[PDB]
């Protein structure tokens, strides 16, 4: 694939600072859909404001976990079928925590925002389309967790 390289190459830059970059993704996510904030329940407590999430080690660890699932996708960008069962179960888990499947569209936009901001002029149309396809494929596999 030509897309596989666009994804690989762009991901190298991000993977140098995945927390800083995932922090943009999540700051953007809560700016777009603050109703996701309460889903991050650590010590039975809700974050009141998005900046609260940034002070939580568990939340920042979830940022790193997200970035690693993306890294797993990138590693398998040629054959995602190898992540299908893991991603189905990841879907099922997020269903269980309360995340609606539709919120994963917002996450995709936040991922694309983060890549735009980091890559600036290197975030070409082809690069955007490539990520959109990969992210879509990830979410398609996760959606199996919502049993459909
Ligand atoms: C709607 C946005 C999302 C919310 C509200 C959310 C929320 C959560 C929560 C509450 C957990 C369990 C607590 C934790 O381990 O931190 C979790 C686990 C996790 N999330 Fe997310 N998540 C979201 C998106 C994502 C995405 C996009 C990925 C990766 C693509 C991801 C990867 C993970 C992983 C790897 C775990 C560990 C699951 C396990 O095996 O127990 N999350 N998420």
Author numbering: 3 to 150
From the paper:
Neuroglobin (Ngb) is a member of the globin protein family that is expressed in the brain (∼1 µM) and the retina (∼100 µM) of vertebrates. It is involved in the protection of the nervous tissue from ischemic damage via a still-elusive biochemical mechanism. Notably, Ngb is also a hexacoordinate protein in the ‘deoxy’ ferrous form, with the rate-limiting step for ligand binding being the spontaneous breakage of the distal His(E7)64–heme bond.
Moreover, the three-dimensional structure of ferric Ngb (not competent for CO/O2 binding) under increasing O2 pressure was investigated in order to find out whether internal cavities in Ngb may act as storage niches for this small gaseous reactant as observed when using Xe or Kr as probes. Therefore, diffraction data for ferric Ngb (Fe3+) were collected at 50 and 80 bar of pure molecular oxygen. This species is not competent for gaseous ligand binding, but is structurally identical within experimental error to the ferrous (Fe2+) hexacoordinate species that can bind O2 or CO. From this analysis, the hydrophobic nature of the Xe-III site surface is evident, since only two atoms out of 12 reported are polar. Therefore, the presence of O2 in the Xe-III cavity supports its role as a ligand-storage site in the context of a catalytic role for Ngb. Our data show that none of the other cavities previously identified by Xe, Kr and Ar docking, including the Xe-IV site close to the heme cavity [Fig. 5(b)], is occupied by O2 even when the pressure is raised to 80 bar. Indeed, only one (Xe-III) of the two internal Xe sites identified in Ngb hosts molecular oxygen and it coincides with the region of the Ngb cavity network that binds noble gases with the highest occupancy. We therefore hypothesize that it constitutes a preferential path for ligand migration and/or a storage site for diatomic molecules.
